[PDB]
Ligand SMILES: OC[C@H]1O[C@@H](O[C@@H]2[C@@H](O)[C@H](O[C@@H]3[C@@H](O)[C@H](O)O[C@H](CO)[C@H]3O)O[C@H](CO)[C@H]2O)[C@H](O)[C@@H](O)[C@@H]1O
């Protein structure tokens with residue numbers, strides 16, 4: 001039984017420098033996906049190596065676009081790969097669930113616009129011009145994530161609240177609103193927080209670039225980049241990154257029809273997983289318990305666990321690479337949605353860690369969804385490089401009970417690294433860290449907006465549950481460039497005692513923390529523990545702590 005390789009299904013639209021009506025055939029997708037925030041259509045747009053002209057690819061919901069060279073410059077657009085905000089009058093605060101990878105862009109007026117909020121990665125791009133992250137106007141925006149990219153000109157966030165860039169090069173960088181964090185960025189502005197609120201690290205401590213599909217002349221393969229310790233700048237500027245290249249014959253090609261049983265029997269049998277674009281329902285976890293297994297998603301491939309099961313269980317193995325998957329809770333509460341490693345997991349994976357990359361969790365919004373904890377990271381050395389774990393605040397099936405989700409991410413492994421951590425709206429602790437020697441570079445949280453009252457969120461004798469808690473038994477932890485925002489629109493008399501909670505210990509340190517009330521809808525009492533000013537006013541002024549402790 002199981003069979004690697006084959007055609008990639010209807011939802012992977014694959015273009016070359018000759019193909020007909022590329023513009024009309026990219027277009028059509030956009031007019032279908034532009035306002036389709038909670039529909040089940042999914043699309044991947046893939047471009048063969050060469051040069052494309054006259055192209056302006058507006059990217060809507062649940063649309064990935066990428067090149068199929070090894071290097072960004074192998075697939076060049078004279079034109080744009082664009083996100084803006086027309087559907088929502090210029091408000092970019094719901095521009096979610098889309099992606100761009102492995103392309104070079106020569107934008108038509110000199111500037112590519114990528115007006116995105118969360119879960120909208122921009123990886124391995126070469127922009128031969130500037131990159132604007134704001135919508136036409138300077139309406140609300142809440143991004144964002146760039147990795148492994150070279151922007152020849154200026155990145156211009158304008159009204160973007162916050163941003164994370166790693167292992168990249170920019171010609172310059174125009175402005176900082178609340179929290180612009182950089183690690184391993186050539187051309188980043190020097191560290192300057194509080195004002196302007198730039199958090200700048202010379203290197204990312206460990207990174208490994210996300211695997212991606214690409215052509216060898218005409219063989220579908222997947223490139224699996226070689227890990228980089230103390231990374232700075234791009235992996236591909238000096239051509240060939242170290243890395244090995246699985247052929248697609250060694251992947252099971254997931255489509256509708258596939259069962260959890262079938263997907264499991266493939267990883268078992270010795271195949272990797274390529275999820276083609278679609279929404280998949282499963283009645284038991286997808287379990288990845290072979291070392292070095294790549295599970296790569298296309299087109300915002302989405303897994304929904306039925307019957308309260310865990311969607312994804314990774315075993316206690318080295319080297320697994322989960323990349324490009326949206327895990328969408330079912331109506332029936334799952335105790336966990338994603339578990340990396342087993343409970344009581346104990347060995348190390350330093351040389352060849354497991355990673356989650358562009359893994360997105362949603363609880364609610366397309367109908368009710370519920371989970372107790374969304375991601376449990378048990379495995380030591382795991383890298384979490386871009387995640388958005390989101391209890392819905394809008395849509396259908398949202399409400400304090402209707403889409404209850406108490407806990408977002410629980411990190412129990414030791415030496416876990418999060419780079420680009422976005423977690424929002426959980427009824428209790430958005431992030432909890434119980435393991436040793438953890439490190440987070442960039443955090444973005446917003447609290448739950450629908451606590452019906454203060455009693456709903458009493459946390460023992462603390463008011464509210466921290467956005468980011470380090471259990472007081474930890475000895476060793478560090479974070480950089482971290483923010484928590486509140487919008488208790490339902491009951492704006494609520495108080496949130498702090499954004500962050502931790503031990504007061506020599507080795508449990510932070511850098512550049514902030515909390516923000518959005519329009520005076522509730523307030524924070526402090527930034528971390530009992531330290532830092534409360535928020536005040538209705539004018540959305542951040543309260544900050546530069547150091548801790
Ligand atoms: O021609 C190059 C030029 O393309 C620009 O893309 C624009 C879109 O910004 C725009 O999308 C509109 C909304 O953002 C706007 O506010 O209102 C309506 C309603 O939805 C939208 O059309 O639409 C036109 C065409 O549809 C696009 O060309 C890029 O932003 C820009 O960077 C680029 O230079």
Ligand SMILES: OC[C@H]1O[C@@H](O[C@@H]2[C@@H](O)[C@H](O[C@@H]3[C@@H](O)[C@H](O)O[C@H](CO)[C@H]3O)O[C@H](CO)[C@H]2O)[C@H](O)[C@@H](O)[C@@H]1O
Nearest residue numbers: 093094140141142161390393394424446487518519540
């Ligand atoms: O609800 C949609 C979406 O909202 C996101 O949070 C937004 C905030 O992004 C937004 O913040 C505004 C700032 O961008 C702007 O600069 O300042 C004004 C104040 O003058 C801010 O309000 O505020 C809205 C609420 O009005 C928030 O909901 C969430 O991150 C996201 O999860 C959510 O889906």
